[PDB]
Amino acid sequence: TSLGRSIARSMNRKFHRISLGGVRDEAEIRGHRRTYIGAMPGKLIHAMKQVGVINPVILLDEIDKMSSDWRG
Amino acid sequence: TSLGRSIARSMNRKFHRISLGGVRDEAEIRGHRRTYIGAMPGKLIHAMKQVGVINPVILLDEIDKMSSDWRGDPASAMLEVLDPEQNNTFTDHYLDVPYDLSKVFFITTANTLQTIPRPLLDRMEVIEIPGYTNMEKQAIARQY
Amino acid sequence: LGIPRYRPDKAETEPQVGTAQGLAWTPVGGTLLTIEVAAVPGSGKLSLTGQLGEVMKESAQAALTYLRAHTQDYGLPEDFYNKVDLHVHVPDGATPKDGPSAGITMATAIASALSRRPARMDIAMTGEVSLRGKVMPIGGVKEKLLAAHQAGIHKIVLPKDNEAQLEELPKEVLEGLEIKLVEDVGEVLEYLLLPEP
Amino acid sequence: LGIPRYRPDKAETEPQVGTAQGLAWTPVGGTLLTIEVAAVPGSGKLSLTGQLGEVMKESAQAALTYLRAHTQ
Numbered sequence: 001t002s003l004g005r006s007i008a009r010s011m012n013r014k015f016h017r018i019s020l021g022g023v024r025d026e027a028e029i030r031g032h033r034r035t036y037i038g039a040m041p042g043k044l045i046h047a048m049k050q051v052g053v054i055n056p057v058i059l060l061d062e063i064d065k066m067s068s069d070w071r072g
Numbered sequence: 073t074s075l076g077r078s079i080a081r082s083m084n085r086k087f088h089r090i091s092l093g094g095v096r097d098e099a100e101i102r103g104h105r106r107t108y109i110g111a112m113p114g115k116l117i118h119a120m121k122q123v124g125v126i127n128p129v130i131l132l133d134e135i136d137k138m139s140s141d142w143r144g145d146p147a148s149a150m151l152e153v154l155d156p157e158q159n160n161t162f163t164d165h166y167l168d169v170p171y172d173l174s175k176v177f178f179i180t181t182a183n184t185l186q187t188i189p190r191p192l193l194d195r196m197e198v199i200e201i202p203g204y205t206n207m208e209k210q211a212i213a214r215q216y
Numbered sequence: 217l218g219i220p221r222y223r224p225d226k227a228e229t230e231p232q233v234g235t236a237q238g239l240a241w242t243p244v245g246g247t248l249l250t251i252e253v254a255a256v257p258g259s260g261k262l263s264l265t266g267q268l269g270e271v272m273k274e275s276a277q278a279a280l281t282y283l284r285a286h287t288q289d290y291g292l293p294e295d296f297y298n299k300v301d302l303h304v305h306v307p308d309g310a311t312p313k314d315g316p317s318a319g320i321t322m323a324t325a326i327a328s329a330l331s332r333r334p335a336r337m338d339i340a341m342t343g344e345v346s347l348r349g350k351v352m353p354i355g356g357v358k359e360k361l362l363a364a365h366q367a368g369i370h371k372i373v374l375p376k377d378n379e380a381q382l383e384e385l386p387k388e389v390l391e392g393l394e395i396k397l398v399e400d401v402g403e404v405l406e407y408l409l410l411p412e413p
Numbered sequence: 414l415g416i417p418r419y420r421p422d423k424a425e426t427e428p429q430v431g432t433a434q435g436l437a438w439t440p441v442g443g444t445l446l447t448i449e450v451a452a453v454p455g456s457g458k459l460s461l462t463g464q465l466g467e468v469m470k471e472s473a474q475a476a477l478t479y480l481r482a483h484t485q
């Protein structure tokens with residue numbers, strides 16, 4: 001992780017990270033279609049929302065730790 | 073898939089590829105009932121949902137690697153995909169009206185001919201792509 | 217006009233192992249439907265195609281039950297239920313009419329799929345099946361016979377207890393079509409199969 | 414009226430060598446529920462058809478356990 005932070009420092013663009021391991025569905029990687037209060041996008045959109053630029057240095061955390069069974 | 077893109081460049085249609093290897097559930101191939109939040113159609117239906125025309129050239133992946141540990145096969149489902157006159161009678165569980173995939177041109181992928189499901193051995197053509205030599209590999213390397 | 221609206225008569229009706237020409241009841245005027253069966257050795261699993269109600273699954277199961285009751289009479293495999301998956305194709309979704317669509321026709325279809333003999337044609341058969349070899353009567357043989365006459369198929373067998381139907385229909389359809397009466401599914405094992413086993 | 418729609422006063426019903434008639438009650442009124450049991454060779458497992466609940470199978474094993482004390 002600090003390897004990626006260093007690579008972004010050398011890049012002089014801001015590092016980011018999102019612990020995407022342990023997620024059981026597509027409903028918070030793509031979000032869901034809006035139908036009520038509390039409608040929310042995917043975690044990636046949260047990530048690049050708290051990164052105020054359109055070209056960050058994004059580091060994925062646990063792709064191999066994704067889970068699947070329901071909700072896409 | 074270079075063959076598939078070659079065919080789709082010949083027809084100037086849209087090309088797409090979807091996985092079928094390692095599929096265990098028929099309800100992965102089919103849809104699901106509307107009994108949960110965000111109920112979903114099949115892989116094929118959403119694959120058509122991302123294409124914008126009803127006659128693209130669509131590739132599969134690893135159709136010799138389905139499985140099903142319960143009664144019935146998804147072999148009968150892609151057999152429903154096979155005949156275009158049977159294409160307007162899909163099994164469906166999220167949707168219900170059988171879609172018109174008659175014009176969707178079908179191209180398929182199976183690495184092993186022998187492990188393709190045996191209810192689908194009818195209306196397959198075995199066109200075996202063999203290995204490659206030293207110079208054939210060198211020539212296609214140096215060329216493309 | 218151009219193309220004929222339907223397939224031309226008795227060129228669609230061909231003697232095959234796979235195909236099966238059975239009468240259907242449709243509320244806009246009944247039709248006949250092409251059932252296709254494919255039995256090469258498997259494990260015993262039944263599979264369905266075409267937005268089907270599950271009742272046709274159980275009617276195919278009952279057909280398997282009758283084939284398990286009387287195996288050796290027609291060259292059927294001695295133990296096929298552990299080694300033959302059955303997969304049928306139905307062109308339409310579900311009959312709104314209750315019961316099996318054509319139960320004994322499907323029984324003959326998968327029996328011909330198991331014995332690998334082509335079905336006889338010029339005989340369109342339908343009925344509803346039970347677990348003791350009793351083909352219980354079917355209501356609405358009227359539109360079935362209308363469709364068979366429209367199919368040009370004049371030989372139409374019926375369940376035994378629909379024999380009183382043959383007096384309450386008016387004559388003009390009854391003369392145009394030949395009718396046999398059957399009670400056993402083993403009886404129609406000899407009436408749609410090209411050889412006697 | 415035409416053909417008698419329903420079977421008359423029952424002196425000879427359908428041939429019943431594997432089955433028997435049965436009395437019951439619906440909301441709309443009772444019918445003669447001739448249970449159809451078909452004894453096919455197999456693996457001695459219990460194979461239900463008829464869109465059945467579980468109450469059927471414990472009643473079934475009640476009968477099975479009755480005649481498993483009463484085989485011969």
Ligand SMILES: Nc1ncnc2c1ncn2[C@@H]1O[C@H](COP(=O)(O)OP(=O)(O)OP(O)(O)=S)[C@@H](O)[C@H]1O
Nearest residue numbers: 073074075076181203204208209211212213215216
């Ligand atoms: N004889 C050949 N076999 C395979 N690829 C070839 C051949 N000659 C040229 N190619 C080139 O190789 C690429 C396609 O082959 P690959 O990329 O190795 O396999 P692929 O098409 O990506 O994946 P597959 O084969 O569908 S699993 C294209 O750029 C082709 O132009």
